[PDB]
Structure formats: C-alpha cells, structure tokens
Write a protein that binds this ligand. Structure first.
Ligand SMILES: CO[C@@H]1O[C@H](CO[C@H]2O[C@H](CS[C@H]3O[C@H](CO)[C@@H](O)[C@H](O)[C@@H]3O)[C@@H](O)[C@H](O)[C@@H]2O)[C@@H](O)[C@H](O[C@H]2O[C@H](CO)[C@@H](O)[C@H](O)[C@@H]2O[C@@H]2O[C@H](CO)[C@@H](O)[C@H](O)[C@H]2NC(C)=O)[C@@H]1O
Ligand SMILES: [Zn+2]
Length: 1015
C-alpha cells in the first residue's frame, strides 16, 4: 500500500502552491480579455508537420435548469436527438458527441425499432460518440462521490446494455469549478482521458502561459502516480463557439453559423457570420486558421481540439445544415491549400485524445503532472461562484438523505433474489435515477428555476418512497421464519421512522407508536446498520405513553430514557420563539446494537407506571416571564429560571458550557482537562447596493458578516442519563446542541423567513492557532488543505463543505462534520464558519433569471469534534492533504449513514426473528461497503452481486488497534462460484480472484468486486 501521509508527492503543478504564488491580477488582455495577445511563428507548421484540427460538434443539454427535464425533452432535446440521427445518418463525415444519458435513454426508449437500429449504427461507426456516459454531467462541489459513481454507473450501464459502448473520455464543460474526485472515480472506471472547462480565469492564464493546460491529474496524496488521468483544460471563458475557436470571440462568433439572424441569435461583437462561398472562402479561412494557430500555441502537440456547440444546439434541421455546409466548405479550402499546413475535419472527443497520445508517443510532447482542485471558480472580476455551495439547502440535505436510503435499499434487498412481482428492480431503478438526475450541475447546486426545484424535490420524494418500500419488504423477509413468510408485495409491513428528515419544524412526518391497555400492549421495532461493523447508536421513537420499556429479542431489558416531545413555535402574539410540549406523545430513547450490514429487533411495551429500566429527563426552560408547560403523564414537572449560563455532561463524555443565550462557549474533554473556548455565533451577510449582486451562483457579500441581534432568546435544557440537550429559539434558527456522551450533535432548524438579501452563517470561534490554514473535504472522499488568501476577496476564500471541515494547530483540532453540503471557510485564525441559508432578491446574471426567494425550513445536522492531536502522526507541512481521526470519521458516518429504524405496522408479527447478520464480519473501522447491489434478476442461473469497497485513511494517534475481522465480500452470500475485481461501475472484469476471495483495499483506495453464485 502507498503511504498517503508521509511522502509529499512531487508534481509539476500543485494547486495550493500555485495559489500561494499566483498574483490574481485582473488585467485587460485585449481581445482575449483574461489572457494576452497570442503570437505564433507561421513557420512552426509545414509540409512535414501539419496542425491537425478536430472540430467536435456538441450540444449542452441540461437535465432541468430553466425548464424541467421533461419540458426540455419535449421542447428541445427530442428534436436535437431526432435530427442528429437523421443528419448523421445522411452525412457520413459529420460527427456529434453526447454526454447526458438521462436524455438519451428517454429518447431511445421511445424510438421505433428501425430508428433504434439506425441509432446503433451511427454509434457503432463512430459518428455519434458518447462522452462520459453518466446519467448527467454532475456538479463536482456539493456531490458526494458515492452519488457521482451512482449516476456514472446508471448512465454507463444503460449505454453498455443498449448501445454496447463504454466511454473512456469524459467531457465536463459546465460544472462550476472542478474536483479531483472526478479523475479518481473515472480512472477506476476504465477512463483514459477527461476534459474540464470552468476554472478560474487566472488559473487558465497561468497554465496557458506554461502550456500546462493538458496535464496528468493525480490525487493530492499519490506519490507514485497510479491515480493519474490525462486531463485537458479548455483555455477560454466559455464553451460556446465564440470562445472555442481561438482567443478572439469577435472572430470566432463569425464561425457560429446559427447567428446570422433567422434563428434569433446574433454576435455581441457586432460582426455577423457570413455564409462561406467560393468568393470569400480564402479570406474566411485565413481568419479562422489564424485563430486556430493562436489557440494551438497554448498546447504542446500538433493536434487541436475545437469544440463546436452551445446550449441545446443542433436542434433545427436548418441549423445542422448551416453549420455542416459552411464548415465543409472551410475544410475543403483549408485542407487543399498547402500554405496553411492544416488538416481539419469533424471529429469526436476520443479521436482528439487518441491523436494527442499518438503525438506524445512519437516524442513530440511530454505532459506535466498536477494535483489539487479547481475551486473556487470565478469567471470574471470578483465574481466567485461560492453561493451555490449553499443555495437551496433543503434539497442539498435531501440529497444526503436519499443517498443513504438508496444505499440501504439496494443493500437490504441484495441479500435475496426477488420475484418480478415484488417490483424491487423497478423501484430501485426509479430511486437510483431520480437521485442520479439531481446530481446535475443545476440540481444539487440550487441553481434551477423554482418550478424545476419542485420537480427535483417531487422526484426525490418518489425515490424515498420507493426506497422505503424496498427496505421494509426486505426487513420483513430477512426477519421472518422462512416457512411462515407470506408476503404481499404491495403491503407496508414496516414504516420508516426518521428523526432528522424532514425534521422537526420542517415536517411532523413522524408516526407515534400507539400503545395502551385497551388497544395494544407492545410494538416491535427493527434497526438496520448498513455499515460493515457492529454499531451502537441511540435511537428514538415517539410513543403515546411515558411508561414504556424496551427489551431485546431475548427479552433482556434495555436501558431507556423518556423525554418530552418539544416543538418550537413563533408566537405571533407574544412575538417570541418558544417551545411547547406534547401532553400525549413522548420520546423514548435507547441504545440499539446492530450487527455489521445487519438488523436487530427490539420491543417497546407499555406499563401502568414508571418501568424499572426507563428514566425520565428533567427539563428547564430559561426565559424571563415564563408561563407553565404541562406535559400530561410525564412524571417530572418542567422547571423554570431566568437565562443563565449552564453546563452539561453526559456519561463520561465532554462537559459543555453554554452562554445565557443557549450557545456553546467551551468544551472540557475530561474532568482534569481545561475548558477549551469554542464559541458558536450566528451572523448575517448582506448584498451590495452598488455593483454586482449575489444570486444563486455568486456570493458577493457587502463586507464581513454582522452578528445576528439575538434579543433574550428562550432556552430549553433537557437533561437525561442517555441524552441531554440545549435548544434555543434564535431569529431564523432553532439551534440545538445534543449530547449523548461523545462529540455533540448540532441541529439547526433554519427558517430565513422573509429576510431578503440575507445569508445566515454559523461561526465557531476558538483559540486554535490555525493561522491561515483550514481543511475542507471534496465530495465526502478526501480532505484538502486550504489556505485563506487575503489577496483574494472574502467570497473566494469560501469552499464547498460537502461533509466536513477542520482547523488545527500543533495541539488541538476542531472538526465540524455535516449532514448536508454547504459553503464555508475559516476567515480568521481559530475560526470555522458554514453558511446555513441565503435569500436573495436579485438575479446574478448567469442565466437563471430569478433570485432565491423560495426558501423553506431545513434541519441541518452536524457533529462537533474537539480533539487533542499533538500525538497524531500528521502529514508534513508541505503535504496538500489532511485526514480525519477515528472519532471524526465515525461522527461523519453517524450523520450520513445512521441506523435505519422500522416500526412494525400491524399488531402482531408472526414468525419474527431477533437479528440478521450476526455472522457478518465486523471490518476495520476505516473500511466501508459503500455499495452492495445485486446485478442480476431472479431468472439468471448465475446470480451476481457487486460491491464497492472504500477504505479511508485515519490518523494514527496512539490508540491501540482492536483486532478486527477480514471482510471478504465475495463470501458474504453462499455458494460463491467466482469472484472478480471490476471497474467501479461493475462493467468490466479486471481480475479473476484466487480462492474467490476479494482482498481488502489500501487506505484511500476504492475497489469493486462482483461475486457470482450458482442459483
Ligand atoms: C445574455 O447575457 C449574457 O449571457 C452570458 C450569460 O448567459 C449566457 O450563458 C448562460 C449560461 S447557461 C450554462 O451555464 C449556466 C451557469 O451560467 C449553467 O447553470 C447551465 O447549466 C449552463 O451550463 C446562457 O443562459 C446563455 O446561453 C448565454 O450563453 C454571459 O456570457 C454574458 O456576460 C458577458 O457579457 C456581458 C455583456 O453582455 C459582460 O458585461 C460580461 O462581462 C460578460 O462578458 C464576457 O466576459 C468575458 C471575460 O471578460 C469575455 O472573455 C467575453 O468575451 C465577454 N462576453 C461578452 C459578450 O462581452 C451575459 O451575461
Ligand atoms: Zn448546464
């Protein structure tokens, strides 16, 4: 295994180092506004060394943005694909590339068989080439790597099945900044090449000046380079035709033949395209070849890529003709005039990369190595695209909920083959596709129109229902005695109970377990643990009595705590935000212990008075002018007091101190240790009253944030043996700190209400001497070192926080883990901050044509981990990565993949069993079974199950390692007949494994395996 900690890779370009040295001055470069006037030597190309130009026609099709997926499909994309089929069929030299398989599958499945065959033929002969082949072209900032892989797999499995092709070149012209998680996943999925476009204009200029726009992109920890993937970065401001032929858009626009007027388009530089004729072709060719040769000066080979496309292009038949005929005329003239020393043709992306590597192999070029990321993007001026790290945070959180529900549904249902009448494959395909669609760079990013966000939400809601159906049918099958099992595949044997989605104040979706002497004495509940290690976690349920006790299914009592059900209300008469308790519903909490990838059953039973193994939390309401708070049968009366500082400790865990406003002020890790200052604060950013306005994409604050004026908020303290909490009703945020004996959990119910032109930030202030350094993750996969740069504006120092961030000094680290991607930074030494929501009245001039005024309450969840790290073996000062500790990694897992909770829906479960998976291996804590998916339907004689196995890297801090069991996923199901290592999409076999044993993987590596079983 490569060491991912102690060896600093040697790369030609390391983006953090480049950032430290780069000036970022925004000077007028001339016609290339963010570059310089490119010069070339005409003598560079000659008879023995021609410039080979590939013009690659393309059409950017957004799967929702300004219109919904279906609206775009009906108005634009079905016509683009129908006319592409016709025109490519009829014009054998014409070419076209296609990226978004969600639309292509949507089209192809509606084609008559003779058109399906025609389509297959133009793909087979190379005229229509798929690039990337994901369901979408995903966002790279907010997306979790697991969902990037899910959508890539959904698109590529469709293409292999129906088109018999698997792209090895990726095309990502539109995400708003780029992540090295993409080459990581793509290189492990068979790819050889990738292309990106939206990188900071200063980076484009710097890399262009060094001809470092094509590079071998390796991961930041990878010393040896086996992760490297050849990457092409486009050099100019846009992927449209004015910015793809060469550096001068006033010239290149004249070669977009859709702009002469009848199509409703024109050239902003005020020189239109002119139809090519014999009379003008020499002059037009001279202008175009000059642009090409300038672009070619920025790259190292004599093979030049010229994309030819824009959004929803190649729609009308007359557009196909006008682009094709004019370019054919240009090519005939240029190719026949030796003085240009150019051979130009339509091509595909794969054609371009193959010719580049042929030139490399011939010794014409060597390419630099690069590591790092390309966040935060700015396309011009100070317009940094950090707003979309937070926009529409309800759906950002929903993404992570559904992420987990899809994993759990696929894993729970994978253990068996299912009859087609159960509709398991149908429901899972729906769930995978709606989650995959939302990875689109206008979906999770929060950059679509309001009605499109509603369409994504509705799709994801249907996907959650599909996951629930599959999970509950699977639990019923896995825990009922086989000779009793008698399923109705349409029935709900269980309902899911989810305490954090949509979340209190977001929606009371939670069912109460109704118990009573004259109706039902007891109820079975079942917990699922998708992680491959034994796990304990407190779980809570709502019950209709406080007098409830818990047993396991050996009838062993389980210690439990009952608390009230508190809900917060904005009281429009007293003008306060305060909690109300239920007098008929209560929360019971207990520790569930669940096998690896397994299930555990418990029983809740009512009794007529306090049970022996159930305790009751106390409750203290801190406010001036209190009023009573009755709680029905709850055995402890609520206490009242004026606001005051308070401190709490659960178990042997940290002691937390709170201000009289209900906000954390310090953490004491042990009885001996110091109370370490850790202060939570809420602040607000506004919008500029002159100049460019923040919108769904851009964050353009009017200066540093200002504190939220808190008034005298009401604070509720609940103190229990198992769980305590401090909750406070602040303006726009019900803020909750929950303690269960280790790192606290923070929940914010964020309702920015009608606060126009406001962004709500949660900041942590500490004494940690972090300086200008902080760490944030990329796609939930890796943590990258960031350096705050005062030479950049505040919004440029914001980065995606897809799952966590930390600061540290020699002795102390503070890590904040998230259950949702949001934007954040460290704007001063010892701070962390993360945006909660943003409400913006204005459009920000990037095409959305609306502000962000559709906010809804969202429950954001976090874990806060303060740790001593002076004993940890950390990377050297020059290393670009950081790594979590075991506690912070487990805390992230507790947010993203909690236990699932099932409530049996009818009165008696006959045949119930107490556990599933007790004989599953409990793997080392840094290993995960990220995916388990049965790949065959029931009629296959040889069943196949795929697994994606990911090992993270945790810091060594001197905790002796607990001997654990080796996990061999190929023996998790019986009767294994073969074990293969595959690409991560499962589509190619890479190794036939000895002994049918799937090896575990190295730290920071991810591997896929498929087990085959005789059935
Ligand atoms: C119509 O207003 C202009 O259009 C441009 C913005 O709309 C353009 O792009 C839209 C985006 S679709 C695409 O990306 C979005 C994210 O933006 C994503 O969510 C979707 O999924 C898609 O993938 C689209 O709706 C339209 O088709 C259109 O292309 C924008 O380029 C332009 O801004 C330039 O022009 C104004 C003047 O009109 C200037 O004031 C700006 O400064 C900017 O000028 C450009 O600056 C760069 C850097 O200096 C130069 O190199 C360019 O040459 C220069 N262009 C021009 C015309 O001067 C407007 O907003
Ligand atoms: Zn797009």
């Amino acid at each position: 295994c490569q060491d991912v900690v102690q060896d600093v890779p040697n790369v030609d370009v390391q983006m953090l180092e480049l950032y430290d040295r780069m000036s970022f001055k925004d000077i007028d470069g001339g016609v290339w506004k963010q570059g310089w006037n490119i010069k070339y030597d005409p003598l560079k190309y000659n008879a023995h060394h021609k410039l080979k130009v590939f013009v690659v026609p393309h059409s950017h099709n957004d799967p929702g943005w300004i219109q919904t997926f279906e609206e775009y499909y009906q108005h634009d994309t079905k016509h683009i694909l129908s006319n592409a089929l016709r025109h490519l069929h009829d014009n054998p030299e014409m070419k076209f590339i296609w990226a978004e398989i969600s639309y292509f599958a949507r089209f192809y499945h509606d084609l008559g068989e003779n058109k399906k065959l025609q389509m297959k033929s133009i793909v087979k002969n190379g005229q229509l080439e798929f690039v990337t082949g994901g369901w979408v072209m995903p966002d790279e900032a907010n997306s979790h790597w697991r969902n990037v892989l899910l959508q890539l797999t959904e698109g590529q499995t469709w293409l292999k099945q129906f088109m018999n092709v698997t792209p090895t070149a990726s095309w990502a012209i539109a995400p708003f900044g780029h992540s090295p998680t993409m080459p990581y996943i793509l290189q492990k999925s068979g790819f050889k090449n990738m292309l990106i476009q939206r990188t900071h204009y200063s980076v484009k200029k710097e890399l262009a000046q060094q001809r470092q726009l094509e590079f071998l992109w390796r991961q930041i920890w990878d010393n040896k380079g086996d992760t490297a993937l050849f990457t092409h970065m486009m050099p100019f401001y846009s992927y449209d035709i004015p910015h793809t032929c060469g550096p001068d858009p006033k010239v290149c626009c004249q070669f977009d033949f859709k702009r002469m007027g009848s199509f409703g388009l024109s050239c902003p530089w005020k020189v239109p395209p002119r139809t090519i004729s014999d009379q003008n072709v020499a002059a037009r060719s001279d202008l175009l070849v000059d642009q090409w040769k300038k672009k070619a000066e920025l790259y190292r080979t004599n093979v030049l890529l010229i994309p030819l496309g824009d959004d929803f292009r190649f729609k009308q038949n007359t557009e196909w003709d006008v682009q094709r005929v004019n370019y054919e005329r240009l090519f005939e003239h240029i190719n026949s005039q030796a003085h240009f020393n150019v051979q130009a043709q339509f091509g595909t992306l794969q054609e371009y990369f193959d010719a580049v590597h042929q030139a490399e192999r011939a010794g014409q070029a060597e390419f630099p190595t690069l590591s790092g990321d390309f966040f935060t993007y700015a396309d011009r001026s100070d317009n940094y695209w950090s707003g979309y790290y937070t926009s529409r945070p309800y759906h950002k959180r929903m993404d992570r909920v559904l992420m987990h529900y899809v994993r759990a549904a696929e894993m729970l249902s994978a253990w068996h083959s299912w009859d087609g009448m159960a509709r398991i494959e149908e429901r899972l395909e729906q769930a995978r596709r709606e989650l995959s669609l939302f990875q689109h760079h206008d979906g999770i990013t929060g950059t679509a129109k309001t009605h499109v966000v509603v369409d994504y939400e509705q799709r994801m809601q249907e996907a959650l229902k599909a996951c629930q159906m599959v999970m509950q049918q699977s639990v019923y099958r896995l825990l009922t005695k086989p000779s009793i099992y008698s399923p109705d595949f349409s029935f709900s044997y269980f309902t899911l109970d989810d305490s954090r989605w949509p979340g209190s104040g977001v929606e009371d979706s939670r069912t109460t377990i109704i118990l009573g002497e004259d109706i039902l004495p007891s109820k079975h509940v079942v917990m699922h643990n998708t992680l491959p290690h034994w796990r304990e976690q407190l779980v809570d349920f709502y019950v209709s009595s406080p007098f409830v006790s818990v047993t396991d299914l050996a009838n062993n009592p389980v210690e439990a705590q009952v608390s009230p059900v508190w809900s917060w209300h904005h009281d429009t008469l007293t003008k306060t935000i305060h909690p109300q308790g239920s007098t008929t519903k209560y929360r019971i909490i207990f520790k569930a212990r669940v096998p690896p990838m397994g299930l555990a059953t418990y029983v809740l039973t009512i009794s007529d008075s306090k049970p022996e193994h159930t305790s009751y939390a106390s409750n203290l309401l801190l406010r001036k002018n209190p009023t009573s708070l009755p709680l029905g049968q709850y055995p402890e009366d609520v206490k009242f007091g004026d606001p005051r500082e308070i401190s709490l400790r659960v178990g042997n865990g940290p002691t937390l101190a709170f201000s009289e406003q209900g906000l954390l002020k310090s953490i004491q890790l042990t009885q001996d240790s110091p109370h370490v200052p850790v202060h939570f604060k809420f602040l607000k950013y506004g919008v500029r009253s002159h100049g460019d306005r923040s919108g769904a994409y851009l964050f353009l604050p009017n200066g540093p944030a200002s504190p939220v004026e808190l008034g005298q908020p009401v604070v509720l303290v609940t103190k229990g043996k198992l769980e305590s909490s401090v909750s406070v009703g602040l303006p726009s945020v019900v803020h909750q700190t929950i303690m269960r004996g280790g790192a606290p959990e923070i929940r914010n119910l964020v309702d920015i209400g009608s606060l126009d032109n406001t962004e709500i930030v949660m900041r942590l202030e500490t004494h940690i001497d972090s300086g200008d350094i902080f760490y944030t993750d990329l796609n939930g996969l890796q943590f990258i070192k960031r350096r705050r740069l005062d030479k950049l504006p505040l919004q440029a120092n914001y980065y995606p926080i897809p799952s966590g961030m930390f600061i540290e000094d020699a002795n102390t680290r503070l890590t904040l883990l998230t259950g949702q991607p949001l934007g954040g930074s460290s704007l001063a030494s010892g701070e962390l901050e993360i945006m909660q929501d943003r409400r913006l009245a204005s459009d920000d001039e990037r095409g959305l044509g609306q502000g962000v005024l559709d906010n809804k309450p969202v429950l954001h969840i976090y874990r806060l981990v303060l740790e001593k790290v002076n004993n940890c073996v950390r990377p050297s000062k020059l290393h670009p990565a950081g790594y979590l500790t075991s506690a912070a990694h487990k805390a992230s897992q507790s947010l993203l993949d909690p236990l699932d909770k099932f409530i049996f829906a009818e009165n008696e479960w006959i045949g119930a069993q107490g556990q599933f998976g007790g004989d599953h291996p409990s793997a080392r804590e840094d290993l995960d079974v990220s995916v388990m998916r049965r790949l065959t339907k029931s009629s296959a004689k040889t069943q196949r199950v795929g697994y994606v196995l990911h090992r993270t890297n945790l810091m060594q801090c001197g905790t002796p390692e607990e001997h654990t069991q080796k996990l061999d996923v190929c023996h998790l199901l019986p009767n294994v007949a073969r074990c293969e290592r595959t690409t991560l999409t499962f589509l190619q076999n890479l190794e036939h494994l000895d002994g049918m044993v799937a090896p575990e993987v190295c730290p920071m590596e991810t591997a896929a395996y498929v087990s085959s079983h005789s059935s």
